[PDB]
């Protein structure tokens, strides 16, 4: 799950999955490039179509055998990234295509604390429904209620009920 | 040409949106009541370098625009960070291109590039920035501080962090107003009037090394050397030369505003002449770079790019000169972190410098078609804009309504992208600045840190002297007053599983390692935050396309700007406010 | 057209005597050396400001004047206090009176008073500012800040006080420096080079709401927002501004000596311009002074007055203007609390702008002749002087000067001599009347030191308490929607309203425990200035009257001398502005 680096057709896919160019991506794949093409920090295409919202892009990535759970040198996943920045579609999708709904960064952080935090709350209700443990604690102890209560935001602490 | 007034300031280790929300902001928002101000613009960097430009109405005094920027200035001095007061904040009425690059080199190579910097900075420079004329003075390289390099592990096993040491630095490496013996108003009878002396600066490395950081219960001492490697080195690490591929200071020197180029480049050549006699065996002056029998070439990596990749592209294009141009270039004078539009580790640029004239006959061997011919041959090359140099448009996209940093750039690549598609009026339609990069970002548990009993000034003191460095205070070297610095030894700060290696002591004296306090993860940010009058704005070029005239283009780019999202304004400058 | 550079400085929860004696004493005795000085005025005012006049001879280059004035500034800014500093001293070189307003309103009705002069100063004001010719800009209203509003019930229910709060927010609301990964000088080979981002500027009233202030022995914690409540809301609450009655802010411009008119006013409706297009949905400006068309109502009632009287008086000029001439004038700027006088609690001013000129036929119906009747209905008003003028050479400006530290309460008796005997010569004197304003009731509170040692309370502790809580403190910046902006900690009303509420703000001493105001001082009423002024570096006391009908100046000047001459040893005199 923790990718190394790929070269000339593996950077040129990583930095087009940043752009979202779409038509490039679709080239570079069928030309051989490596779906898993990590950066320096450990970022494969498919996290980088997450962080910057391009749906199309993980679509596609998904399509040619990208891993879903792919770790950053931190433990961060696609999915960590896409359910911190509220990106509704991607969060869908990469559960859709296996994407681990408790997975723990280096800090036990997981997917439901960070939409928890950034109030993505649509985004905090398809985790839950996907299996996400909703009693999961990160190295301080926290879990998303208790987020929820530092927040004070009440809309949240309903949902997680 | 319209005259332009340049603020400078730093902040060690502040990346740019600390730059821009502390400092850069703020001068801003008081740099009113000024006379003759066309427009305003600015670049907060994640060097910790700020330089805001304010250009004036044509015919306007630079001398009296410079004072009315200094006043203002310093009435927000106050509202600054002590960080960066205590840098010095220059102000500058100066051209943007350099008058003149003196080298200096060692020919017995007695002395290392760094050697050799301190030599300038410390011997040279003052009295060539005092010169007449003289604008501005760019050191190509840095001035030698005391560093203080901290090893994590050592300061751990004797319960000691950053925040110790430079308490103790402060301490012992102090400079005391200690009165008289017999002084004013002194009683009837006195017959001695002597001064007292108590502590003085330091003046070497064996002198800071054994500062003394605390005595065990045991009895045993714990000195500075004990917990820190301790060496002359420069203030920063940024800036590397050479010439003719050997090692090399300098000083890039700008003209004033006004002043004569002539007479200015006679004045330094006589300054000059004074600092030879004494300058140690091996040192000579080289003259790479006068103002046509000079060109410059530019180099511009991707940011992120480390001083490693764009030296090695610095080499090929010193290599091109040294072979493929040989019977034409006298000389290339190279600098690495220092390029056209400011400073990072990911720019560069070369001053070239052509045989006589008289031995370069023909038209093929001429500036033009040798700059021609080199741009040509450099722009093969791999994740660089590489070009050889002696027509467009210059925009603002400016952020109106509180947009922020990530929708402007999402406004900037609609732009972009539909300027593209127009290819027919549009070409070479690019950002002049940088793009996002991967950064670090680590969160403190304000309470796992109260819980323990550490404080947050530790932390956050510890954090930032051992990864980004901290100016303490000054000591005197070989007689001239300098810097003082803490820093990790590079071992110690290259890597995230580092951070978990330095401790900090809490209340109760237990030492604490990071991890128990803090979480991270990577986030993009810039390195490079921009604004125009005030407001955040990415600065956009392009020409228009052949057989198409300048107006043209500029009315599409409006057109297509109106149709940007809401809150999204934009401006002409430079070449295209008249 | 004499140039006047003024210097201005601000001093959060000051008395007149404390912003005196710590910033406009200090700044004076730099103010020598100085070509073409005529004079210098200065007034230390009850709101935390001071005001420095220097006024120049005629020709003086204004430029050049500046730059002096500034360069002995710079002598005294050290010795200032630092939160006089912070707020930033401003040195410049206007006219006295403003060139035009610009007014702002929400036609939606969307936006409050609050949020539109927020909106004015972060978007509008700077630019406006730096434009050339603009040489001072006031706003009429205040920039949003972060209010910290504190109770003393919660602070003191969990042991805490304003000084832990101010503490927790310089640490909890920071903007911190914490280098790079894999920053020069490098281990030779490194591929990886990051930014460390830690702590930034907080940008939100919910970021606020969760700093941890302190985590209880049973584990759980007390947040900001269980002390107080948090909100957006003005630097302060002394400028509020109508337009026709409707909510409004704005911007008073007054033109850079030697500046021209035309020019300038072209070029602030050609940066207005560029704004407009990115206005919030309502927002509107509108133009209710242009400078015959247009004149001013000024509003003075007596010290100690409120807001709320302060506000019924310009109700009532308003009202005047929209009822009784309607038919001549279209608009009316009414703004409470700025006025002719500078700035404070008892004043307003009302700018008001007429119809076409050819929609108003007769002379009973131009400038003269309806600020005559305005000025005539006004004057019926009691506990205020309105009066209503256009914008003479028949009045006098005089100074009555203490030369000899007799203090500010016998310059007062001295001053009630020449005022009454002024007052018995009706033939050559008429309306001879301070400018200034009269002393007011004012709490006095003397702390016990002795006390305060044997409790183990330190002076700053308390001092910082007391002035936090009924004064208010700059803490810090935060960044509001990308713009920098300041954090402010104060009482909320409801705890710092009546004597009484001085006795619920607790202290902590050395040993933990918590010690309420009542145990460490006593308090008395007594009287002070919440205006004194001074006359090149002495107290002083202007005081304006006019020559009796008929007889020329130079003979009412002759009168008032000999007046003078019988003053009190240490009482001299002066003559300024017209007079001189």
């Known amino acids: 799950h923790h990718h190394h680096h790929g070269s000339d057709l593996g950077k040129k896919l990583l930095e087009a999955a940043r752009a979202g160019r779409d038509d490039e991506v679709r080239i570079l794949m069928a030309n051989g490039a490596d779906v898993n093409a990590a950066d320096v920090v450990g970022w494969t295409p498919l996290h980088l179509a997450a962080y910057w919202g391009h749906l199309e892009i993980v679509e596609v990535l998904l399509k040619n055998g990208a891993d879903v759970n792919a770790y950053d040198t931190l433990g961060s996943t696609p999915l960590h990234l896409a359910a911190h920045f509220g990106h509704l579609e991607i969060v869908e999708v990469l559960l859709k295509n296996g994407a681990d709904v408790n997975a723990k960064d280096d800090n036990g952080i997981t997917p439901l604390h960070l939409a928890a935090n950034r109030g993505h709350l649509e985004i905090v209700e398809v985790l839950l429904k996907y299996g996400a443990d909703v009693n999961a604690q990160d190295k301080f102890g926290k879990t998303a209620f208790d987020i929820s209560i530092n927040n004070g935001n009440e809309d949240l602490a309903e949902i997680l009920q | ?578």
């Open chain 2, 1 to 578: 040409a319209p005259p332009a007034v340049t603020i400078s300031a730093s902040y060690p280790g502040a990346d740019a949106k600390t730059v821009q929300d502390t400092v850069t902001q703020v001068i801003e928002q008081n740099m009113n009541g000024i006379d003759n101000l066309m427009y305003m613009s600015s670049n907060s960097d994640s060097t910790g370098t700020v330089q805001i430009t304010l250009t004036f109405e044509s015919g306007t005094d630079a001398d009296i625009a410079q004072v009315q920027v200094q006043n203002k200035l310093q009435l927000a001095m106050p509202l600054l960070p002590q960080e960066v007061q205590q840098q010095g904040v220059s102000v500058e009425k100066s051209s943007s291109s350099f008058l003149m690059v003196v080298g200096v080199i060692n020919t017995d190579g007695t002395m290392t590039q760094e050697d050799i910097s301190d030599y300038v900075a410390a011997n040279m420079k003052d009295a060539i920035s005092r010169t007449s004329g003289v604008g501005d003075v760019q050191l190509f390289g840095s001035q030698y501080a005391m560093r203080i390099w901290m090893n994590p592990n050592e300061l751990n096993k004797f319960q000691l962090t950053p925040v110790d040491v430079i308490t103790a630095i402060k301490a012992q490496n102090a400079q005391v107003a200690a009165g008289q013996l017999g002084g004013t108003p002194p009683v009837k009878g006195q017959q001695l009037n002597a001064s007292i002396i108590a502590q003085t600066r330091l003046t070497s490395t064996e002198e800071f090394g054994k500062i003394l950081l605390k005595v065990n219960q045991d009895g045993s001492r714990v000195l500075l050397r004990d917990v820190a490697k301790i060496e002359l080195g420069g203030e920063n690490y940024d800036i590397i030369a050479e010439f003719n591929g050997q090692p090399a200071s300098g000083l890039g020197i700008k003209l004033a505003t006004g002043a004569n180029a002539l007479d200015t480049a006679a004045a330094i050549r006589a300054e000059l002449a004074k600092m030879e006699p004494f300058f140690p065996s091996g040192l000579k002056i080289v003259y790479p770079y006068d103002t046509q029998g000079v060109f410059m070439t530019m180099v511009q990596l991707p940011a992120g790019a480390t001083q490693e990749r764009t030296q090695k592209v610095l080499n090929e294009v010193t290599h091109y000169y040294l072979t493929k141009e040989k019977n034409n270039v006298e000389s290339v004078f190279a600098v690495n972190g220092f390029g056209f539009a400011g400073r990072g580790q990911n720019t560069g640029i070369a001053f070239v410098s052509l045989k006589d004239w008289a031995d370069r006959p023909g038209e093929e061997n001429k500036v033009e078609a040798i700059t021609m011919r080199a741009t040509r041959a450099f722009s093969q090359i791999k994740d660089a804009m590489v070009f050889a140099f002696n027509t467009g448009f210059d925009f603002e996209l400016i952020d109106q309504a509180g947009l922020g940093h990530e929708k402007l750039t999402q406004a900037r690549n609609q732009l972009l992208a539909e300027a593209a598609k127009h290819p027919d009026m549009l070409t070479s339609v690019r950002p002049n600045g940088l793009e996002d990069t991967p950064q670090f970002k680590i969160d403190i548990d304000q309470e796992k840190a109260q819980a323990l009993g550490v404080s947050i000034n530790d932390i956050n003191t510890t954090l930032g002297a051992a990864w980004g460095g901290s100016y303490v205070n000054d000591f005197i070297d070989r007689g001239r007053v300098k810097k003082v610095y803490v820093m990790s030894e590079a071992k110690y700060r290259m890597l995230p599983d580092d951070i978990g290696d330095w401790y900090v002591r809490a209340a109760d004296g237990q030492m604490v390692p990071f991890s128990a306090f803090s979480s991270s993860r990577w986030e993009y940010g810039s390195p490079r935050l921009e604004r125009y009058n005030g407001l955040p704005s990415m600065e956009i070029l392009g020409q228009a396309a052949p057989g198409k005239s300048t107006g043209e283009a500029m009315e599409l780019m409006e057109q297509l700007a109106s149709k940007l999202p809401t809150g999204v304004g934009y401006d002409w400058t430079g070449m295209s406010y008249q």
